Structures are given as structure tokens and as C-alpha cells.
């Protein structure tokens, strides 16, 4: 026997700007909106879900197991189970793979999997148990410390982007021209409603009126080459990596309902793809941006695919330095990568990002009629992750 | 063939008291030591490890992916992978299930899985990005907030254990008799040397001298009934759960080394046991302590076992109310349950506990000649987790 | 020969709104600009200053003795001295009386006195030296706790205002009419340029552009009765005191340069006024708004003046309720009182407020040729302070 | 008529060690006990007090105007007034001069003046209103920032002491001997009972029992030269200033009751002394410890006294470096200086200090029948204060 698991349906919230639309929205509320979206999208009841798996890197102050909080809110019953996980920036795609294994091993019928992040709602913290007899103590930003800081080399993820830039000799112009392309592609898809299918509106409840967010607010309209070239380097003071050519700090969530291919056929569901293979591999944390290269190669090797059989790719844009590098090495046609733009434009809600690009990949595959696709992301601390999808 | 996954080796640190031995020791330092110890007792080099999965509930401020930090510090190379997960209190036993599924689906050969927790190091926090225009606020204790406060009703786990008491008509004398029986069992076994084999010593690097922690310090010697019956209830001013018949707040780590049964035989490794089956199930959050009941029935049914078949049990004592309710329903001989003691005496490092009680079961099964064996736990928010084990 | 002290020159900054124009300006920067202004307006050099005395209620986190920081920044020599003082709302006026006394006793020739306050920059705090063993604790708003809360009764100053409303039988209509009138009179004075003489502009230094602040930003233009009528009681849910008939939370500095009458004559300075008398008296904390009553009476008795001898009055408007009470009891003609509006409109930068209203008195006295003035304020904790000024 | 003000009576608490006897005692509680004491000692009823004046550098979080808190606790009537002031280390003496001035200008008859401080209770703070959009921020120790750091050069008072050691070429051995001598003189004086007359005991109310504190707890008994010599410099890795030859962080209060000489005679009071003169002068902040030189010289000139006229002197020991420079420059017989030890032994409760050493001077003057005395302190930010006292 050979299991065969499918992504029956999918949905992501809009990607919100740092301290923007979802500045005060807990992640699990966003998780709840995507959970109910994929349940109604597949025509599966919440009472049929066995388990819910959500990546999330910054859960501090949100209470017990936010994965359970989002399941219970979304109308999943208490007889189910739920948990979160953290492979950092790869978390939201990894969870989908972990959900695929629950079914493959005979321990679940129907999983909901993805990620959720509120980088806005991430707190400052300090270890205050001992007590402070004298002297300033630091209140630590958990978003910077737990999401953006290499634990081994002490510097920001964007410094790793400098390392990869200098390795591959990627000029400031090349990085900027990739950054403006991503903003133009993304603004172009948004106008044309190519993001409508995947986005489920989130309602931000308010004292003085409810608001419906259904649009990626981080996309810069009319992004220009000169606007990119005007900027100062954020990390290295004589470097190449600017705020324009790296992705942002963002809020959002994204998911996929998974079931066996036969169960989908029982119920008349038309899946957004079969999960044919997946893989995660580690590299040096100094150049974590190279993660997607070994990861995307192993995934393809597991599918029995060559790189030149693909039709579509989502390769996550943490930095125009590392995105450009991954693309150079693997050699896939750049006109099939980030067709609707990438993270530099859309945003980078860490734990949600992997389900985010997966959502974007599956819907464009349905839209253009691509059969073979791949989603991959670089990962802080030096990993990569990847997934090969085939359209039914 | 059948995916027949074994536990090649196992190791834990001793469990520390809150702000005690491991007071200022990062969880990942504690998890580093167990990853080396599992690799040593098996005879398996760190380079051969594909991935490290560690359950951990309270990572705030410890930096990017402490599972990865634990693995790198232990000498597992950059090429391997690592990630955290959180199903609260079952996390450590569910990571062993997850790592098993890696091997069963053929995505990995060798996994080190378990849990780690530093509850002493968990910080206080607040969301301060919007600022606080006027008026007092709370700096929140993330240990309480994210580790012990049920997200649904707003209260402590010691009130969910009170709901199990009023429902199952347990007395203030019935619980006081179970807590002293688990402190006497654990003091007995400790002075016997039955904990020796599972514990790997941890070195607490001081400045005015090192200290070697090689014994659980939450175990209290000479537990009387007067001290247990003289306390005031902590979670209800006229109630039955106290500090003495509830579990503690603790630090600790624990892990198993996993591979296929065929691979153990090639390497000349006599495995502690074979993982026959596992399961998790949800229950009403209000009465979370009854997770072990349906979870152990699911696990047992999957193995094709009766409750009678079992020769040794590890039912985690989060409380004396949840524990007695699980022992009475399932009706298994309590003379074989928590045979060297439970978490009232031993302690309760949230994320580690699942991996902690797996150690105790695996080393006692080896020693007393018990063929079959089940470990089980209750989980906050309303779930249960269980894993059946068979001897070679 | 009895010591005669004169106010040679005075100045204030504009009064900023809470987290408004001066949101991130330390009180001492504001004080430094007013110190430089009184010196320039009197023709006295910084080098001649013996002492600076600045009332200030909320200096936490600003560093050692902000009054010295203000004097040094203003170029007052290191050989001079400087100190801060605190009689709450009375501070800025009390400091002038204290300055007067340094010259009366022969200990100094030349004093700059007043006060300064940045309610905006006041921090949140907690006592964390003992160490917090477990659970949540409070970050205390120092502005509320140290500035606005009665230390004996534990309620806000606005609750003392409610006590005064009840005792003097002051309707919500009478309080709201008074409030609207203070806004309309301030708006009119502002429009006609009656605050220009007293205000020295303040340059808020910026990364991306300097902003000159020379207008009182808290004054509401076109304030309507209905806008006051619509508000909810802020302190007693069936009370009369609201946000609209109370003063606000504000930032500013204000000062006066003093010397003897004979000294002003040698220098050829035409002084703003002679300090004829001052007084300070306690009342019940519960009705602290009544402070001005005994304080003004005692100040007039010391001058040898009848209430009817006054040509102009500044009675500070902490709350409409108390301003009304004061005016009723004293019986002075209301048309000579706060002729250019009061603190309901202008603001109440606590430690500066007494020097703020003295500036307004002095510059209107000059403009209209009023010979006899009085400035008075109520004081949290139950006190009053009053000063009689006569024109030369 | 040249007003002649006497110190009718005086008192102080013992000086408490940092987080020691008065660890959770608010400063106004200490002040209340000394207010009661000066009244009882002088035979004056609380109802007769016109004003209370208390220096206090670190009032954050204690609530509105702690001077008023103290006065009201001590039964001083609501109709009196009270205020705090801040001239840093000079405060507690300056407040006495300012009290004298109330009486001298005919504004009051009876004043209670001194200082109070609880460095233990001083909180950590931060400005949080604008929010912290991203990145770490410090919780600031208000004791260090507002008490002990130079606001201009950003360094500790200890560095100014190093500046004075370098400038006066004061060896480590000379400073250490001075420090040892302060300890041994204070020990001898404590043992002989010489602090008993000045100290009023203070009841620390407990929950498991009340503790009466009537001994200065910071004084080290049996202090050795070797114990000073073994310390490492605390501020300059190659300096001379140490924990041992500097004063400490402390809690306490101290006060004097003032009235006219003619008033004491009416009441039949034998006063502790007549205030003959006072002075305050500025110096370079970099060498603030030199303050006492120009202040003492100025106070003596004012009194009409030569340095040689003095029979007793209290010169506050902030640091052995500056105490030594002061004594060298003035050249007064070091045998009449700090005859019962100084603040290196006794402690330095900032705002209370100047009234602390006034108390010790007055009670030793009475003891030995000394006719002419002077007290002086150096002040943070570069100032000096001094008062001349003559026995009746």
C-alpha cells in the first residue's frame, strides 16, 4: 500500500503590516478564521477534524497552547487534539508535512495544518525570579530575540543575508532589482484579484466599528528602482542589505485541510494537490539562506523528479540576497518563481510563512493549470524545508 | 514488513526544584546533555542523527529554536535538523511519537526525541508596542500564563483537578494517601539506586565552582500524613487539592534514541523496548485530568492489547485527583502503577514530563522483567496522550 | 528698610497636550529654554545667576536633580546652585516665594524660580529589589500615583472635586458652563495674541526636522456646551465631574527672574511686579480644591489688602467644581478672574502650573495696567498657595 | 532685629543597611517617627507645627508628596503645610536652612525640617507611553539614575571621587586608613552609647512580630586594614576608590525643630543651638566631592568666624577621597572632625544625610560642651552646602 495524502482545501489571512491591521489581534484568532475557512471550503464539518497542527515561533503571553485556542474558537470540538510547533521560518510548511504523516501512519483521518504569527503582539520579557537588588535590566523583545536573532553568532538574520551576498558576489543593484520586481509582480497580482481565492477576510472586532481586512497591506504600490537605491543598509554599515530588499515584520495565518485521496473522493472534494514528497536539511547558520538548496534538491529526489519537470515554484523571499542565490544555484526558470511576487512585498509572518506561500502556490497552480510545483523556505539557525505537489 | 520502531537508548537529567539546582540553567543546556547521553549509551555517533525533536512549552527569550541550540551544543552537526513542539504536558511523550513517525514514513533513519523545560528561567512579559498611554499594567508570569492557566475559563490546572474531585467523589484523605504513597515509593526507589540508570548527571557550571546534579531534588524524604493533612487548599478556599497532593514546578530534560528494529540489530544495540502503538484524545478542558483514560484505551486497542495484559504502567501524577480517577476507571492493578513513584514526588517539568516517565518505564521494564508496558499523561486544555511499549 | 523683591522678567513655554508637542521632551530642556528667556528679557547674563529653583513633581528617570540640568544647559555657571522642590500643584508658585526668601534673607542677589513638568515623559515603575518569587505584579504609572492620587484616601483628585461639587451644591450645568467659558476666553486670548508676550517658543529637535512650538496646544477651538454636556462622569458614575470640566495632563515650564527692587533700579529694569506677600495653608485632603480660600485670604491679610482691592486674579482651574467654589466663597468679581482663560483650556503641567499662571497674571497686568494682582492654586493632599503682586 | 533661629530639638532614626532593617519601609514612615520625636523632645505639640519640610531624592512610587504623608501620620494638623525638596546629597541640611528662612521672613513660627530616604524602596522604571515599537529597552534603577549618576558625564559619583583622588594625589593606602578610621571611631561611639541621644527607635511592624531598630546597622565591627586593602576598585579597573572606602546605599530619616530664639525662651526650651549662618556654592560636577570647601568657607565668612574658631565639625564622608581633599584644603584639626565616625561607617541615606550629620553634630556639641560647630556635605552635580551652629 502507498497512502496518498491530499491538500483538500486551503486559506490564509491577509498579511498585515507590523503594528498595522492586526496590531492587536492574537494569532489564534487569525488561526481560527483560517481553520473554519478550510472546513467550509472542503465541505467538512469541524466535528470531523481529528487534530490541528500550527507552526508558531512567538507564542509568549498568549496562554496555553494557542493551537488548541484556535481550534476551539473555530468550532473544532473538545474530543479533538491540537498542538503548535517551531521550525522557525519553515514552521508553517513543516506542520503540513507533520499532518501528512499522522494520516500516513494510520493515526488520523482528517488534519488541519499550517501556521500563525502575530509579530505585532509579541511581548518584551525579562527573567525576574531571582530579583534585582541593583541595576538596569533589559526588557527583551521576544520578536527580535526568539525570531530574528541567530543564537550561535549573536547577530540578526539580515547579517546572514550579508554573508550569502558576499559568498555569491550579489551586488546591491541585483538585490534591489529583485526587490522591485517582487513589489511590481505582487502589486500586479493584487490588482488582478489573483490573491482573492486564497484570502479569507478577517474581521477585526472593535469598540468603534468592525473592519474587514481582505488585502495584503505590506505591498508597496508603484515600487521604483530609485526608491530602492535611495535606502541605507540596515545591518552592515557598508553593506548591501536594506529594508527595501529584505522582507518585513508581519502578522497572519494560513492553512490546509488534509485527508487521504480516497476520502476526498468519497465526499466529492477536488483537492488543491497531492503531497508527493517533502524534506528538511541543515546548513551552516552563518549562511542559513542557502537552506532551500539542499532542501529543494532532496524533496525532488524523493519525488523522483528532475528540476526541469516543475511548472511552478514558491521560494520564500527572506532577503533579496538569499532569494537571488537559491535561484542561481538550482537554475529553475525565474519566470515560474514567485509569479505573484514574494515576501519582500507580501510580508513575512514567521511561523505562518510556509503555509502562506503554500496557499499562494496551490491557488496559482489551480488558476494556470500547472501540474507540478514546489514550496521552499530558508530557516534561521541553518535549515531549509521543501514540498513537492502534484495536481490531480 | 511493518514499521517496527524501537527505542535504542534513553536518558534524562535529574529533575530540579523550582529556582533550585537548574535555577539559572537554560533548558537547551539540559537538552544538550541528554542528546549526548542517548548517543553514548547506544554507541551511536552524533553525526548519524538526522533530526532532534524536543517538546518545550516555555521558550520565551531563550532565543531562536532552543531545540536547535540543544542539538548543536551536544555535537549533532549542522547538517541535521531540530524543532520544538508543544502539546503542553504530553509534549515530551508526543515528541517520541513524532520521531517514530519520521522513521515509519522513511524520511529519517535516526531520531533523538523527548522534552525539555526550564520553568525557573521562564520570564515575565508584557505587550508594549502600542505603549501604555496611562494607568497601571501587569507584567505577566509566562510560566503561569502559558504553562498553567487554562486559556478557556481563565483558571489554574489545580481547579481542573478540583473538578475531577467533585465529579469522582474523592476525599481530602484519599488524595493525601496517594501523595504520601508516591513520595514513599520514590524515596524508597531513590535510595535503592533504581533511578541511577536513567539519570545522566548534569554539570551546573558556576563561577565559584561547578556542581554535579545527579539526583532529583523535588523528592522529599520521610513523608508523613500530618504534613500532607495540615496544608490549606491552594485553588479553592474550602477545597481538596493542595501543594502536597498536586505536582510541582520543575526543570529537567529527557530523550529517547529511535531507529528501526532492523537498524538496532545491525549495530548490536539491545533495545529498551519496541514502540508498538500510541494515541492522543481530547476531553472537556474543565476536567483535563481524564485525558489518560481515553488515550490509553485508544493506544491499547491499537496494539491489540487488553488492560489486563499490561505488566507495568506509568500514569503521570499531575494531581492526586486526576491520578486516582484514571486508576479507578481503567481498573488496572495499582500495585504496578508508578512503581518507583510519580510526579507529585519526582516533579513536573511540563515539556520534559512525557519523556521523563518514558525513561522510568523503560528502565524498570528492563530490570523487573516486564514484557509489556504503557506510559500515559493528562494534558492542559483537554487532551490525553499514551504510548504502548513491548520488550525484547 | 524691609526687603522688597521684584519679578524683573518672566517667561513660559507653550503648554503641550499629553503625549503631544513635547511628548518626548525632558522637563529640564523646557526649563532651560525658559531660564534663557527670563535672562534675555531682563537683560541679565547667565553668569550673574546665583540659584535656580524649579518646582517639579514627576522627575523619575530624568537623572540627578533636573533643576541643575536645566541651569547648566542654559549656561548658568557651575558656581551657581540649583534645586528642585515639590508642593504638588502649588510647586511652581511656591518656588517663586522660596526664591524671594533667598534674597530677603541676604543669601542671594539673583534667582530664577518656577517649575517644570513633563507628564508625558513620566515613567511606569515597580519595586523589584526583594525579587518577585512567582505570579504577576503591577507596573505603576508614576504620573497617576505620585501626581494625581490622594495618598490618604487612595482616590483621584477628581474625586476630591466631586466632594467639593456635593458640598457647594454645584450642578453639572454650572460646571460645564464654566468649562466652556474657560475654553472660549482662552481661544479668544490666543487668537488676539495675548499669550505671545508670555510665551517663549520652544524648538523640538528632530531627526527629520525641527518644530517650533509657540502655541498652547490643549485649548479647544469652538468648544460647544453640547460637547461638555455629552460627556460621561469620569470618577463617580452618577457624578458631575468629567474630562471636559477638569483640566488635563500636560507638559511645560515657566519661570520668573527675581532680584531686589533697588537692584532692578541700578540696572534700569522696568519690573513686571513687586512680590507684596504670599501664603500657604492646609485644608482637608478630601476637599483640597478649597485650598485657595484660606491661602488667598491669608495672603491678602499679609499685604494689607481687601479682596475688593484686586484688579486682576489668576485662580487655577484644576476642576470647574473647585474653581466655582473658590470664586463663590471669595466673592471677587468673576470678570477679573482668569480673564484669558484657565487650566481647563490651557492645561495643567503640575509642577509648572503655578509659574504658568503667574506668567499669565503678570503679562495681563502689564497689558491692562492693573495695579494689584493675585495668583492662587489648590494643592493635592489639601493645601493652598497664594501670591500678591503689585505693579511698579 | 536680625532674626535668630534656634534648633529647639532634633532626632534621627538609626541608619539601615541596603535592603536590611528598613528594606520595605516607605521613607515617610521613618519621617513620621522623627517628626514625633522632635515634638516630644522639645515639648511641642503637633498642633503647633506650621510646616514640615523634608529633603528626599528618591520619592518615586511612594505617592503624592511624602513630606505631607509623614506630617499627617505624625498628627500634624491638615491646616499646616508640607513639601519636599531635592538638592541631592545636600537636601537634608538645605531643608533646615530653608526652614530657618520661613521663620526669618515671618511666614512661620514653628517648622519641622530635615530629610528622609529609602534607597531600598526606590523602584525600577521605564517610559512606556509612546510604546517600544521594536528592540530591547532598559528598566532603569531610579536609585542609580536619579540618585547616583552624574547627569552630565554619565558616570557614577565614584568616578568623581576618582577625579578628586587623581587631582589631590591621594593614595589607596591613605583612603583605606581613613575608611578604617571612620569604622573604628563609629564602632567606639556606638559601643559607648554616644548615638543613643540622637537616635529615636523605629518600630518595623511585622506580620509575625514587630522589630524595634535603634542601632545603626551599617557600621562594621572590627574592621581591619586588610579588609579594605583586599577590595578591587569599584569604578576604575586601575583606580583607588572601592566599596570599602566609599559610603553605602542606605535608609533613614532625620529632623530638627526650629523656632525663633525668643520663642524657645518663652517656652522655657534649652535649644541644641542657634543657626548662625549657612551657605551653598557650586563646583565642577567632575569634582563634586570638593563642594564642602567653598561652601564652608562661605558659611564661616558669613558667621564672622575663622576656621580655627570651630570646636566641632561634621564633614560628610561620601568617599574617603573627597573627605580627605576637603580636610587637606580647609586644614581644620582632623581630631575635631567626625569624632564619632562618618558615613563610610554609618551609611548615606541621600536625602536624609545632611540632617543625619546635623544630628550627630548637635548631640556631640551638647555632650562635650563645644560652642562652635559646622556641618557640610558634597553634592552630586557639583555643589556644596554648610551650616554654622553656635551653642546656647
Curated annotation (Swiss-Prot), chains A, B, C, D:
Please list the reactions this protein catalyses: 2 acetyl-CoA = acetoacetyl-CoA + CoA
Query: What superkingdom heads the lineage?
Result: Bacteria
Q: Which Gene3D superfamilies match?
A: 3.40.47.10
Enumerate the GO terms in the molecular function aspect.
Answer: acetyl-CoA C-acetyltransferase activity
What's the EC number here?
2.3.1.9
Repressor as a keyword of this entry, yes or no, is no
Q: How does it assemble?
A: Homotetramer.
Q: What is this protein called?
A: Acetyl-CoA acetyltransferase
Q: Which gene encodes it?
A: phaA
